[PDB]
Amino acid sequence: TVSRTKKTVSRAYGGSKSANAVKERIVRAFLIEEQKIVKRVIKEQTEAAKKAEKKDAKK
Amino acid sequence: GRVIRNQRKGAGSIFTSHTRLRQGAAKLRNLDYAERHGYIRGVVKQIVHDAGRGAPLAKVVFRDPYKYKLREETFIANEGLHTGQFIYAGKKASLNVGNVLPLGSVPEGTIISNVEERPGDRGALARASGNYVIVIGHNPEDNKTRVRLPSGAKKIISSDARGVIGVVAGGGRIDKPLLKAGRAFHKYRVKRNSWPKTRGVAMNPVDHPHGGGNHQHIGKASTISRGAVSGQKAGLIAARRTGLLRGSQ
Amino acid sequence: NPLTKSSPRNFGIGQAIQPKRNLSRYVKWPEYVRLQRQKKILSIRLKVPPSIAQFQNTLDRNTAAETFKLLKKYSPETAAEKKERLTKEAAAIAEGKTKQEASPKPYVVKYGLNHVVSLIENKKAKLVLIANDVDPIELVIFLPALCKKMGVPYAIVKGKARLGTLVNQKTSAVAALTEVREEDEAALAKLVSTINANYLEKYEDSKKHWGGGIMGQKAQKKIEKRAKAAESA
Amino acid sequence: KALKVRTSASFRLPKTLKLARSPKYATKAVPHYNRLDSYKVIEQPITSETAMKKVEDGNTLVFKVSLKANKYQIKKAVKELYEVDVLSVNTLVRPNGTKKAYVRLTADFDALDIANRIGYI
RNA sequence: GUAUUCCAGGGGGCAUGCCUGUUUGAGCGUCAUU
RNA sequence: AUUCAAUUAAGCGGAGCUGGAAUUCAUUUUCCACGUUCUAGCAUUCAAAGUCCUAUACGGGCUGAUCCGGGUUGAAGACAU
RNA sequence: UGAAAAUCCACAGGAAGGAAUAGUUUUCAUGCCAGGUCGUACUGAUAACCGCAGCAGGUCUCCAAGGUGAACAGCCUCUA
RNA sequence: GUUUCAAAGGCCUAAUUUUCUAGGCCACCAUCGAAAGGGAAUCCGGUUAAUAUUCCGGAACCUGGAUAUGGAUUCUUCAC
């Protein structure tokens, strides 16, 4: 029977995780998503090129 | 005479385990699809001291493939693990310290612990402090690897059975002497009621076979047969050798 | 088109929660369901004797339909039609006094096991129809051997329920004919000659051969694979 | 043929049409009259020398109450019999094994005037 | 007492095993019909 | 049959795709692989595609997730009990 | 390496629901009604308990002043 | 023996506005066990031959019900 302004602070994860915890996991969540899109860039370029490279072995 | 201490431990009134500060049954994950074929990610969050156990435990968080949920499993920590570390369990999992592999996808001369006797046993062989199982041999016909247990006696185990890589943590526990008797008390205080053991020869002839007589002597041979009965078996049971052994065990 | 976006899920072992599949194969049934399904299998795997094996030789779909078209004629009275007949009886007896010829002579199919066995024993029954799924087989197993000795046409047929439907019953077990009208005698003898080819003529043949000894799917592919590698290497 | 599609690997009891009661004869025959009446709850007015001192000063009249009597029931009983609006009820069980109910009335009704009407004073 | 849901008061009900029937059902255990 | 173990009885056994290829050369002839490994994030109410309609509001069928046998799976076995 | 569960709260998540001639909020300010049942005296010991009894025995706890002195030691006072 | 080789259920919203029917989700499981463990919320002053955090006077607080006034929020909106 207390107001929830006293229970919580106004931020993302609020009254559960600390501010420096939210600091890091935003930086992680962002930076991993940048690395995950490069997994396409490496494979799409190489695996498509592998079909050209493997055909040279037959000729 | 009376029922001897030997005989009356199996009743289980006082002679029972003290499971107050015991964390949980230290076991492996269940089998099937995910770890049969591929592998799964797991994150070690805590490394805990279990009460009355020479082994620091580890609690790893895995996902449920069929639900939006999380199931924690209590692993025995091998010396090398740390909190905030990834673990890889399955057939296709790689060979590192902590990772759980089946015996078939492992080369000869490797080191492991918490090994299953069957597949789906959830652990049995080599769970104590500073112990580890070594893989020797292999077979194509009959999925059955050759394995050496830490006592010395070798054993044939199925190839699909599991084993966590590395030596079990908390090693060199036996090296320090206990000194004062109060240190020994606190060891058995968090296990069973098996300590202050009186010598059977000091007792009366009613309470124990060796007991009785004007001088404290046994009287007859302490080497007792395998084909005996409960009450008689107090001494060396089915002994091949006696006396001081030299070097080779 | 513009604001809409595609999003593939990927169910590659570790990635994503798996979708809803039909797991009808992996359901834990009740104990009574597991009993009746395993009782089917236990009889098939063991070698069944020739006396039990002959009930598998059932009447085919095309021939059977003609038989029950015949036997739905010469069916017994419904409870209302018996009450109709007894009112006619009471009228003629009071004013007339005539039993034995009045309310004609009924032509009707014979049923009941103890009732039918006596007709076969005195060479009276022309056609007989035996059920394939009686609870103890001991009840109905000896009837094929009895009809052989006396030279009576007989035919095993599916559904003890279907024999019950033509006689106002839940289950009948057996159903035989004796008396029949002269108009429908031509069609009856046509069925007997068709029946005797399968059942009565092949009694000495059916007595010899054993049934059973049929393995499950995992056992079949194990034997076929093992036979291929060693012999045809 | 064509099986019922089912996602779960469990098999539970299918809920069925649960039918209600509809008897051919009554078990009781005659419904019983009121077990606890207005007159049966409040039995006697207590006339000890201490109780006279409370009636004058405290504006509170005291009763000997039967066992199996709630403070809801005693509030209803005094309200019905003597036609008075009750403020509060306090109850205790005596050492001899009989319940006693202290009852305080509102400021409108004087406890001394109603006391001389009932019998005692 | 402002009341399908909250509070109190007066009255009537809710155990287990087994039998006979009634109504809903479960199972490619199995039969005929589209 | 009897015995032992595990799960809320999910992915058993065999064929088929695309495989990528295989070298007697593309094959009704076999081997051979299957979507995640710098980081203590995140993953749930079933979406795109085509097909029609509910008259396009809000949503129905077929795919996305292949098909066929309903033996839950693995020991052990005419020994043991 | 020094209990468990009832119980209460917070966050992620976006289900469903809403306006202007009117509508949402009862985790805030005020205001209204109700709160059952049983225990409640006194003793707790050189006299209310157990020990044949008003028996130098035995029986779990809390509060705790001044001076001397290391001191909850011994010896002497105040309140009761 | 107490979760097992059992077909082991009780929690929310409408539909219907006869108050009886429809939506749904979710699922190895009785019940007893502490007046020193856990635990919703009360204090001062007065009064009796003998009772009080329990009666009287004065000032508070919690849980469960009902509910309407003020304030806040709203042209792009669930505050800055």
Curated annotation (Swiss-Prot), chain D:
InterPro entries: Nucleotide-bd_a/b_plait_sf, Ribosomal_uL23-like, Ribosomal_uL23/eL15/eS24_sf, Ribosomal_uL23_CS, Ribosomal_uL23_N
Keyword Transmembrane: no
Keywords, comma-separated and alphabetical: Ribonucleoprotein, Ribosomal protein, RNA-binding, rRNA-binding
Keyword Electron transport: no
Leader sequence residues: none
One GO cellular component term noted in the UniProt record for this chain: ribonucleoprotein complex
Gene Ontology biological process terms in this record: translation
Top-level taxonomic group: Eukaryota
GO molecular function: rRNA binding; structural constituent of ribosome
Disulphides: none
NCBIfam families cross-referenced by the UniProt entry: PRK14548.1 (NF011118)
Similarity section: Belongs to the universal ribosomal protein uL23 family.
PANTHER family: 60S RIBOSOMAL PROTEIN L23A
The name this protein goes by in its record: Large ribosomal subunit protein uL23
